[PDB]
Design a protein around this ligand. Structure first.
Ligand SMILES: Nc1ncnc2c1ncn2[C@@H]1O[C@H](COP(=O)(O)OS(=O)(=O)O)[C@@H](O)[C@H]1O
Ligand SMILES: Nc1ncnc2c1ncn2[C@@H]1O[C@H](COP(=O)(O)OS(=O)(=O)O)[C@@H](O)[C@H]1O
Ligand SMILES: Nc1ncnc2c1ncn2[C@@H]1O[C@H](COP(=O)(O)OS(=O)(=O)O)[C@@H](O)[C@H]1O
Ligand SMILES: [Ca+2]
Ligand SMILES: [Ca+2]
Ligand SMILES: [Ca+2]
Ligand SMILES: [Ca+2]
Ligand SMILES: [Ca+2]
Ligand SMILES: [Ca+2]
Ligand SMILES: [Ca+2]
Ligand SMILES: [Ca+2]
Ligand SMILES: [Mg+2]
Ligand SMILES: [Mg+2]
Ligand code: NA
Ligand code: NA
Ligand code: NA
Ligand code: NA
Ligand code: NA
Ligand code: NA
Ligand code: NA
Ligand code: NA
Ligand code: NA
Ligand code: NA
Ligand code: NA
Ligand code: NA
Ligand code: NA
Ligand code: NA
Ligand code: NA
Lengths: 510, 510, 255
């Protein structure tokens, strides 16, 4: 289908002959420079390659507000997610319209030249409410208030080069490249499958059903740009995708990585995803249950209805110009050993089975055995390997402040005690001295599977520098993960409590 | 048998009622304090519990020189290894005879009070030559010149408490305790087996043959104090011993950990070991091939003859007062599936098999399969788990100084590249900034199995702070582990060389 | 001992007959279980015979059969006790039973399912699977319907080349029958041999009887086509995908 807006805005192609010139300007000592934030690197790449057609830069206030309140660009073009260049007051103050800014990656690789149209201060509360539904726990809202700059810079782009990537060079196909891929294969019907999670059996069946329904080839188009916090890293997922793609009949599916930065904006994002997939050459786009939805908030309430996305996409059906293949909950049928859309069964006459993502991590963290019917063996192997069970996970024991015993001797005791257990885990007494360059290394070790014994707490002003993952506090306080009887409890006693606690949480298995 | 010298010098028992008094003196702000070095903690524990009877302190110059040149204490008592308290000039200068020094552990736990008899400066060259045979690569000689203090402090001890240990509290039996152990069991004949390596099938057979020859019960008495550099840590070995002990018939063997600090002094040490085991209650002591020997030097020549220890022990036979069970090379007999002393076979009429320690590590480092005949499965499992094969080992790539390319970009490229391989390894770009507190952490990560990408070298003055284990240098230099074509070689090229190098060395397996 | 008898599946009458035959052969006792010699149910789901008609009939001729009959009621499996037993001496709900009818049995055999260790011996199932292989090892035919407007020659080649890339030990062949019964009668032979046949044309209705309909699928725009096409001139790659996915859905292909 024709790219959204009618013209694929591949600016790399467009500006080719200005490459050298733009590059010179980008590195001229006079031009103002802004180093792109991670999400911005994702967005900038989708803008320059045509993935965000008709966009050709970051939204000015006129187009931005029109998207917030109208799900459309100022000219009426259907567009639900605002793509803006967020900066800080300090930087915002150095620019005026007509100004040319050089956009860099890692304060080293010049990506593009942005010609300023305007500099405004968005009302983040409206964007949060109208665009992401207002809930403060929503991933896009939390980003908007805690990471995003408070000033947006609307302006047009001139491409120097797409952001740099050293992993999967062959797989990050651009819209132009994907289209050629499909053509060389004479693929004129292609249903695209969005995803940010590893694909299990349900998904494989879902995608094949779609290929059959639409009479089209399958395009696995996963997001490797930025997804929901806590998601499985993309490297692991790519390994999973490349593995599961082999379960499809020969020459029916194609894999391509999408460097998109999701907002987990349920229904709006679904519309957005469809527009993006259309730009990339897809003729069909799948939209299953809770598409692009971030689940429930701490109160247990849904951020979106399980089918809001489908409803929203349905209402823009006649102007999306890409056919949507909707799916209802796809579940497992024990008694028949096969999956099927929930909308064509039940009646109690048939029993179903479903292993939610939650329950999935549990087995992964507890060494549980994931059902042969749920996912392929090769896939679980890859997953377990990236997210090992507790007995192979790292951790830290922080000797609380209330501790009255010798921190030095208690540290040694714990070290010697853990050492006798064996199991391949590496241990270390870790003195941070409140130095962030040491604090920031704590999760690195934990990530490496090592066990750390930290004799002292770090000042509260630095608590943010350390990831709380698998970090336990040994203290007399009520907020201690491992609570002590008294501040001067004898070491052997404290040691037994720490050992049994870790044993109870699966870190040790005898 | 009667402890060496006739009286078990269990000073903990002797000084019991002086415990409180000595403890008060040890913590009095006026007394001079010396914090025991690791090897000293091992020695101090063997002196205070009677393991070094008749010793009751660290050798004065008179007894020390008598041992260096006579293998005897000044009074004629047979004693081959000099046990001295080595300190530095600074400390030596603050003490005179009659002075009382407080000996601490971890500058916190008072171990004993030493009454000074003299302070002398030993001729380390003589001790090295007469006691350890002179070769500069010999472990005891390298320690003597690079770790030991240049001043010795002879003097008598008054025990406050044995050095603190939080691991294996039940297994570190003292001579008095072991003797009681044997008695409660009515064991009047016990053959002790010394060791610093994990026990394999050959050893199990060796020890059983001994039990049968001597008509005595078996005492597995391994060293957990200090052995040969590069040896398997004692925690792993203890796990191995506890595991292999189960392959003995019920109630024939006893396990006890010896906190001895070996000197790897072949024959002399053998004599010493025998004296030590006698003090501990053994009636028999095994002495196999190259007992307490450190193998060969870099030139391939033996530090000791494979049977020097046996010869030396034999010549002191009538005064050791503990029976020695000598063994010749115990090897494997394929054709008969069983081990046997080499002195009672060969003749070519029978083919043998032997997997030297060298070859042993190779399989462990290469994921090789260790023969069912060589060692028990449960044992190899424990070993592999502590010394994982290359595909699970950590490593570091240091971007050499000659590097002309962007260290920042080359770092990211390597990171992104390693990340796509998967396999449970954790990676990190590690910037040390020449800070030893960061440098000293490098081997910790490697030990944790992680892969580090270090963008810059560390000044040569700090090279000692980093263990060279699995640390590779990427440079154009000839001394580079991974040699580059030119300092400005393009990244993708450098990346391929690094990947293929690591792949060739087993770190990556596809 | 093998009995070269030609059954009539005549339930109760046949049971009487069987007993007479076994008596002639030297037996002193003859077993008569549930639905003995019965052909199950008809297309409407109704029984051809009562599950115990045979037993009743045999019982009424008891005094003149001169061979003793050992009657049995439904013998079923007892999970909780791991053992089988006549249904007439249990139930009461106090005990849970289990029964894998013959129907369900073929299903696993055709779907590669795993037959329970309690149901049959391993050595037996092995022999059965080997004689009645699962779909992924079964043969089949795709008949290019008459309504087909595309090049039958090119569509045949496409299907052949497509199936060939899957691998799995199956042998494929474009099979031209030319309405010759000597060729038609060979179709099931190949299917029986596990081979996959691509047949470019239908055979005249007057010969349809010469071919066993087993695993023979019709690719056509008609409603009676096993694999229904959108249009008679649907482009080949499209038709190929439909045929592949259909066969994949019916277990002939597994990836
Ligand atoms: N059980 C299911 N039934 C129907 N659709 C599903 C099911 N699971 C996942 N999907 C669909 O698969 C696509 C991607 O799934 P996910 O990676 O989990 O999440 S999402 O954030 O990319 O939407 C979405 O269209 C989603 O709705
Ligand atoms: N193959 C062997 N034949 C005879 N004796 C052996 C053999 N292997 C080991 N031993 C003996 O076992 C004891 C301890 O062995 P090791 O742990 O390797 O080294 S040692 O430094 O403690 O002697 C020593 O008496 C040694 O000589
Ligand atoms: N579950 C069962 N309980 C009692 N009898 C059975 C059962 N299954 C089979 N039988 C008996 O076994 C004999 C032969 O069984 P089948 O081969 O299945 O069928 S039959 O056509 O020869 O009767 C018959 O007497 C039949 O009634
Ligand atoms: Ca703000
Ligand atoms: Ca819900
Ligand atoms: Ca108290
Ligand atoms: Ca010196
Ligand atoms: Ca030799
Ligand atoms: Ca050059
Ligand atoms: Ca019935
Ligand atoms: Ca047509
Ligand atoms: Mg890129
Ligand atoms: Mg101790
Ligand atoms: Na179009
Ligand atoms: Na930089
Ligand atoms: Na359609
Ligand atoms: Na809703
Ligand atoms: Na349209
Ligand atoms: Na618990
Ligand atoms: Na201290
Ligand atoms: Na000399
Ligand atoms: Na004897
Ligand atoms: Na010699
Ligand atoms: Na004696
Ligand atoms: Na090589
Ligand atoms: Na009836
Ligand atoms: Na009769
Ligand atoms: Na179906």
């Amino acid at each position: 289908p024709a790219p959204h807006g009618g013209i694929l805005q591949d600016l790399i192609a467009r500006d080719a002959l200005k490459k050298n010139e733009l590059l010179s300007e980008a590195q001229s000592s006079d031009i103002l420079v802004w180093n792109l934030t991670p999400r911005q690197l994702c967005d900038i790449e989708l803008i320059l390659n045509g993935g965000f057609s008709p966009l050709t830069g970051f939204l000015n206030e006129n187009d931005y507000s029109s998207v917030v309140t109208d799900s459309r660009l100022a000219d009426g073009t259907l567009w639900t997610i605002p793509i803006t260049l967020d900066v800080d007051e300090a930087f915002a103050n150095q620019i005026k319209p007509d100004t040319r800014i050089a956009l860099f990656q890692d304060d080293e690789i010049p990506i593009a030249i942005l010609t300023v149209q305007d500099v405004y201060k968005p009302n983040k509360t409206i964007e949060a409410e109208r665009v992401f539904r207002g809930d403060p726990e929503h991933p896009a809202i939390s980003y908007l208030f805690n990471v995003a700059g408070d000033y947006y810079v609307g302006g047009s782009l001139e491409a120097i080069q797409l952001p740099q990537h050293y992993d999967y060079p062959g797989l990050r196909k651009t819209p132009a490249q994907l289209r050629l891929e499909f053509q060389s294969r004479q693929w004129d019907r292609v249903v695209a499958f969005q995803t940010r999670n590893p694909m299990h059996r349900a998904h494989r069946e879902l995608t094949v059903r779609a290929a059959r329904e639409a009479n089209a080839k399958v395009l696995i188009h996963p997001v490797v740009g930025l997804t929901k916090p806590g998601d499985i890293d993309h490297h692991t997922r790519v390994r999973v995708y490349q593995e599961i793609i082999k379960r499809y009949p020969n020459g029916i599916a194609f894999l391509s990585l999408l460097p998109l930065a999701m907002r987990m904006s349920g229904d709006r994002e679904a519309v957005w995803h469809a527009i993006i997939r259309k730009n990339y050459g897809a003729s069909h786009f799948i939209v299953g249950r809770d598409h692009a939805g971030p689940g429930k908030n701490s109160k247990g309430v849904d951020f979106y209805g399980p089918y809001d996305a489908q409803e929203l996409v349905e209402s823009y059906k006649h102007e999306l110009d890409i056919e949507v293949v909707p799916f209802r909950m796809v579940t497992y049928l024990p008694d028949e050993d096969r999956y099927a859309p929930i909308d064509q069964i039940d009646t109690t006459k048939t029993r179903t089975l479903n292993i939610s993502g939650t329950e999935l991590r549990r087995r992964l963290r507890v060494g549980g055995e994931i059902p042969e019917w749920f996912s392929y063996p090769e896939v679980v192997k890859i997953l377990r390997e990236s997210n090992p069970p507790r007995p192979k996970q790292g951790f830290s024991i922080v000797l609380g402040n209330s501790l009255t015993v010798s921190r030095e001797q208690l540290s040694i005791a714990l070290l010697s005690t853990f050492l006798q257990f064996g199991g391949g885990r590496y241990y270390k007494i870790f003195e941070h001295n409140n130095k962030t360059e040491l604090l920031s290394l704590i999760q690195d070790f934990i990530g490496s599977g090592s066990g750390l014994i930290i004799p002292d707490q770090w000042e509260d002003d630095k608590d943010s520098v350390v990831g709380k993952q698998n970090v336990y506090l040994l203290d007399t306080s009520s907020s201690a993960d491992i609570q002590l009887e008294s501040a001067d409890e004898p070491i052997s006693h404290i040691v037994q409590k720490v050992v049994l606690f870790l044993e109870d949480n699966g870190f040790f298995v005898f």
